[PDB]
Amino acid sequence: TTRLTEPQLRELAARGAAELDGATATDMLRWTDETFGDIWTTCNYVVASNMADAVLVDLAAKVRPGVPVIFLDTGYHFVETIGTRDAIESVYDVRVLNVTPEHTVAEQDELLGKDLFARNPHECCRLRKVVPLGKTLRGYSAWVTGLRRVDAPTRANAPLVSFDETFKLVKVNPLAAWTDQDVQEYIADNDVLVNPLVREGYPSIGCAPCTAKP
Ligand SMILES: Nc1ncnc2c1ncn2[C@@H]1O[C@H](COP(=O)(O)O)[C@@H](O)[C@H]1O
């Protein structure tokens, strides 16, 4: 009742992908803000960040202060990740939303067995990450992700702007064309907060039981 129609969203995603071909991340964020601004938590587009660094958060706040950003609090997070989330909420001009599943960790352990991540990690991710993310994305017309094509060989064709079929709405990846050197230089130039575990030999940060230890 507060999202654009699916054909309208598909046409908007097509036009955005065609017009923003080879554009910078700030240009894509400006286009997203101009297209989904009104009709500062009265915004119609949200940003998703795993709280590994405040690059995308800083960019979105510089293009749109008070922008909302969601963080999927699966309950299995590192204490450093929650600390980084709180620090980003305090420093940057961003409205943070802690998306939590309807069932806590103890409730899920009681209902389907303790340590579901060990027995069915796909179902654990679907219950604590995918379903709450979908329930939160209802009402927004577009979402912004910090996905980079260098994350995996299967992500090499990650589109700049597209229509996410899983959640059925516009998906924008400003950091797609970015490389490791690019994010490094940006981190340097803007003095943006970084999760402390990244310094302690952790390329990617996720849930504590499902993160590869060095
Ligand atoms: N726990 C999370 N909480 C909030 N956003 C996330 C989370 N995980 C991934 N995202 C989104 O997914 C991107 C990275 O995906 P991945 O390659 O699975 O780590 C991030 O830049 C965000 O756009």
Ligand code: SF4
């Ligand atoms: S990363 Fe592991 S603990 Fe976190 S939701 Fe997915 S399966 Fe569960």
